[PDB]
Amino acid sequence: MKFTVEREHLLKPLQQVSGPLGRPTLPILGNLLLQVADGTLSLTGTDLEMEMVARVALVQPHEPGATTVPARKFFDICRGLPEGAEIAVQLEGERMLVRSGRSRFSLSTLPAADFPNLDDWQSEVEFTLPQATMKRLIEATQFSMAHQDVRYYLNGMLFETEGEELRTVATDGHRLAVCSMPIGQSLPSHSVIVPRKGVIELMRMLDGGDNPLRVQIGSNNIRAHVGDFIFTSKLVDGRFPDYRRVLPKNPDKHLEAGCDLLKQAFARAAILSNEKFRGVRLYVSENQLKITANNPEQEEAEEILDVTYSGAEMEIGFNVSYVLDVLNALKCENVRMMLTDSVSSVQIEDAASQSAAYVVMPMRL
Amino acid sequence: MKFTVEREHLLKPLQQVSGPLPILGNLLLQVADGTLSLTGTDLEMEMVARVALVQPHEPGATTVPARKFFDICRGLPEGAEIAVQLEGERMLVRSGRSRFSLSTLPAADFPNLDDWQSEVEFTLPQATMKRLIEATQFSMAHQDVRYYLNGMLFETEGEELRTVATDGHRLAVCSMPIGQSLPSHSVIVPRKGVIELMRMLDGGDNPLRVQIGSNNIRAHVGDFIFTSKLVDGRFPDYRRVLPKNPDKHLEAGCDLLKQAFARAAILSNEKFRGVRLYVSENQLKITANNPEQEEAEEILDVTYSGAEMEIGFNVSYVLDVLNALKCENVRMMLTDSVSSVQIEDAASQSAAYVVMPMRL
Numbered sequence: 001m002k003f004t005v006e007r008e009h010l011l012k013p014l015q016q017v018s019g020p021l022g023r024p025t026l027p028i029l030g031n032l033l034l035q036v037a038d039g040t041l042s043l044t045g046t047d048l049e050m051e052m053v054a055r056v057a058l059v060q061p062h063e064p065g066a067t068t069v070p071a072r073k074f075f076d077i078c079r080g081l082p083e084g085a086e087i088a089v090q091l092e093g094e095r096m097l098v099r100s101g102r103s104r105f106s107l108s109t110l111p112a113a114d115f116p117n118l119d120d121w122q123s124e125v126e127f128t129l130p131q132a133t134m135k136r137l138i139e140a141t142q143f144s145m146a147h148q149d150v151r152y153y154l155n156g157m158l159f160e161t162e163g164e165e166l167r168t169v170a171t172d173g174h175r176l177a178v179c180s181m182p183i184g185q186s187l188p189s190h191s192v193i194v195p196r197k198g199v200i201e202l203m204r205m206l207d208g209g210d211n212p213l214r215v216q217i218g219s220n221n222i223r224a225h226v227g228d229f230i231f232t233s234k235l236v237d238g239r240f241p242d243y244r245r246v247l248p249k250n251p252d253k254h255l256e257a258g259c260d261l262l263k264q265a266f267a268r269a270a271i272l273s274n275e276k277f278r279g280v281r282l283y284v285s286e287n288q289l290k291i292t293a294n295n296p297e298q299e300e301a302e303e304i305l306d307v308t309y310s311g312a313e314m315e316i317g318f319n320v321s322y323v324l325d326v327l328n329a330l331k332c333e334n335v336r337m338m339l340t341d342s343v344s345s346v347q348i349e350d351a352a353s354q355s356a357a358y359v360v361m362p363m364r365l
Numbered sequence: 366m367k368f369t370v371e372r373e374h375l376l377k378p379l380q381q382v383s384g385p386l387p388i389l390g391n392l393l394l395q396v397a398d399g400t401l402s403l404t405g406t407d408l409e410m411e412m413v414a415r416v417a418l419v420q421p422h423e424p425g426a427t428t429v430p431a432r433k434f435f436d437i438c439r440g441l442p443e444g445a446e447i448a449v450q451l452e453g454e455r456m457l458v459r460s461g462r463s464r465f466s467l468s469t470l471p472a473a474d475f476p477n478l479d480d481w482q483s484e485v486e487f488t489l490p491q492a493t494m495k496r497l498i499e500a501t502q503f504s505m506a507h508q509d510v511r512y513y514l515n516g517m518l519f520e521t522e523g524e525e526l527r528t529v530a531t532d533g534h535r536l537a538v539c540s541m542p543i544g545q546s547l548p549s550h551s552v553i554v555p556r557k558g559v560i561e562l563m564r565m566l567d568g569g570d571n572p573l574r575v576q577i578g579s580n581n582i583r584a585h586v587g588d589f590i591f592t593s594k595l596v597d598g599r600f601p602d603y604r605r606v607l608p609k610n611p612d613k614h615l616e617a618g619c620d621l622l623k624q625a626f627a628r629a630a631i632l633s634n635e636k637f638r639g640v641r642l643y644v645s646e647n648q649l650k651i652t653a654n655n656p657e658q659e660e661a662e663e664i665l666d667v668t669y670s671g672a673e674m675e676i677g678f679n680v681s682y683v684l685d686v687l688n689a690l691k692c693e694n695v696r697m698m699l700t701d702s703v704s705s706v707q708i709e710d711a712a713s714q715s716a717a718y719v720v721m722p723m724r725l
């Protein structure tokens with residue numbers, strides 16, 4: 001295996017394929033697989049649950065073969081060479097040599113044949129969509145995923161295809177986010193859970209250019225192709241909660257207000273909320289929202305805002321971090337809150353669109 | 366105690382005094398003679414900021430939680446007016462229809478640095494003080510048992526102010542002219558003090574007044590006053606640290622040398638990163654290896670005079686120097702494999718660096 005490649009054509013691929021990898025559990029999992037075949041250098045990184053592959057075209061002389069080498073060390077070497085450096089690589093059994101100018105490096109190898117390899121699988125649905133749509137879908141919901149919950153299915157994001165819609169859903173059992181976007185082709189009904197790190201990888205591979213994303217889903221795997229990057233993950237083997245059953249059934253009290261005005265008021269009140277429980281109290285009355293916070297030390301914050309509200313007065317408590325997370329994800333002019341009573345969840349949406357919806361349970365407070 | 370002031374006028378003061386037990390997490394607010402003073406302290410140093418009060422106000426003082434008060438002010442909208450009124454065990458803060466009640470501790474409980482007397486005084490541009498500290502601060506010790514190294518020497522000599530910092534392995538010294546004849550004097554400022562002083566100094570052209578006592582230093586710029594205790598011990602004499610007669614001279618591009626060190630270090634021991642330098646006629650070779658038997662080699666074209674020699678260095682020590690220099694060409698002055706080396710910018714003799722070698 002031999003190749004020579006310009007520094008900048010190797011650098012972003014190395015960064016991308018290292019995504020799935022600080023302290024590898026076993027050494028080969030801290031390595032990348034390098035493969036030269038048919039005019040292409042392929043680079044692969046994996047954590048045993050997902051893999052990221054980059055294809056790099058070779059315009060300079062090369063010889064086929066494969067090995068694995070430490071990802072961080074190889075990336076750092078390539079990054080540290082000067083702009084435009086020509087990076088020559090040659091496999092020499094238990095070592096891989098790297099040379100550029102009068103810089104020389106020898107890296108320890110492990111066999112390509114020992115590199116873990118996600119199984120082949122069969123796609124059952126395939127579709128294309130703009131990068132921006134996938135970005136919107138994930139950014140709208142990712143913050144509501146659980147983190148290290150014993151309920152493993154919640155530490156992932158539901159991807160659901162239905163008719164001409166792709167939908168993401170995330171929840172940690174306290175708050176839920178759901179987003180639906182049209183794709184312009186009719187899809188079979190599929191519902192799959194993508195693991196935490198996989199959602200991060202999908203997000204990371206979106207360059208923000210005009211390349212479309214091609215998605216394939218099977219029973220136990222998902223794959224996304226963007227440019228010369230191919231991401232594949234195993235799916236989480238569980239049954240996700242149904243968002244339709246958690247949306248409040250008849251939330252007739254409707255509040256409308258400016259997103260940023262609400263966000264900044266909640267942020268200020270939060271300063272004097274209980275440090276652990278983060279509770280704020282909302283008092284809604286005719287065209288007015290009062291937000292109060294107090295902590296065990298008896299300090300107090302009060303914010304009064306002009307809003308549009310016609311329903312009955314009520315008082316309801318929320319974890320202010322859950323509210324702030326939603327307002328931060330909406331990034332819109334105006335927000336609608338849909339309330340029922342003091343012991344029931346609130347539904348929050350962009351006043352302009354029902355494409356995303358957020359459900360937050362109240363606090364006893 | 367009552368005042369009303371624009372948020373804008375509080376922001377910089379608040380960030381400055383939030384820099385240094387429970388009452389130490391509070392700020393002292395004092396209204397007197399048409400001024401609001403804000404003070405923060407950690408018992409070893411204090412920062413005072415003053416803000417003029419044109420709106421009606423009433424004298425008095427209290428202490429409130431620093432981070433809470435700062436976060437409230439910062440969290441209010443651009444252009445906000447902030448009204449404050451003391452109500453016994455609470456301090457009321459009002460802006461528009463935002464209202465806050467903070468718990469207070471009495472002003473009388475707020476720690477004061479003992480009064481002291483100035484012995485040496487001079488004014489210099491804050492830019493000069495920044496340059497002196499930036500040139501040297503990275504060589505201070507952190508939490509050494511030799512407490513006098515956990516800080517920076519400030520020395521006046523002739524017409525110069527000099528800073529010296531060392532951790533026992535490497536040393537930095539920088540001298541700048543201040544345009545007046547000074548007494549010969551030296552004090553050690555604690556490292557946390559150095560960092561707080563440095564953070565008080567922005568990019569402006571602004572006179573800085575320094576007053577040094579037996580046990581304290583004070584620095585005044587604009588409407589900020591920083592005071593710190595000094596460290597009471599015997600600081601090493603940099604003159605005895607500088608190589609006395611280096612007979613080997615290496616000159617190389619600063620950035621080329623930096624990047625070669627940085628690359629080679631990738632394959633050094635991760636827990637203790639060093640490289641070997643081999644100097645010979647017109648060339649520098651830098652090598653590294655690790656327990657996995659991985660190896661790096663860098664060859665540079667350099668200007669060199671002297672006998673061939675091999676010498677090792679701690680990567681971080683050399684990188685810290687080259688990053689501080691930010692110049693075109695660097696000079697290294699060597700003696701032998703077991704002796705310290707001096708490193709300087711080829712085009713400036715304002716700062717010098719000494720680094721002990723590392724055995725590999």
Ligand SMILES: C[C@H](C(=O)O)c1ccc2c(c1)[nH]c1ccc(Cl)cc12
Nearest residue numbers: 531533534535536601606719720721
């Ligand atoms: C503790 C002792 C001292 O004189 O205080 C000390 C302080 C600084 C240094 C040293 C020994 N030995 C050294 C060798 C090299 C350098 Cl750069 C600095 C030092």
Ligand SMILES: [Ca+2]
Nearest residue numbers: 332333334352
């Ligand atoms: Ca809107």
Ligand SMILES: [Cl-]
Nearest residue numbers: 004005006009
């Ligand atoms: Cl190339």
Ligand SMILES: [Cl-]
Nearest residue numbers: 088090097099
């Ligand atoms: Cl090579």
Ligand SMILES: [Cl-]
Nearest residue numbers: 369370371419
């Ligand atoms: Cl004012």
